[PDB]
Amino acid sequence: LLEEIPKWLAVYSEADSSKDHLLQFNMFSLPELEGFDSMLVRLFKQELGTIVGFYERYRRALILEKNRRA
Amino acid sequence: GEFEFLKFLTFDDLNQRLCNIDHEMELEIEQLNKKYNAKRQPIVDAMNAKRKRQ
């Protein structure tokens, strides 16, 4: 499948650190673990683009509203 | 639409929000950076162990 990110990985990144330790990452091959790592990084960028996109609109919404009053 | 509530703000309130917007983003991004770094550590530690084991 194309650019697949396993659902469990997404859940993992959104959860807290409490049950981190019980991850048997040893069971995976080095390539799969490099896979997981790079997927987290994509997840970061997604969430980052969302954050940064919101603040685009928000800023633009504000300035539009100011001009309106003037 | 998404920001309809801004129509209820005073003119100063709008400026005040425009004042705070950058810093507000920088905090958000920092919390994000911290979040993912701590999520990667387990994986990165494992790879290091694989590399040392083999």
Ligand code: NI
């Ligand atoms: Ni495929």
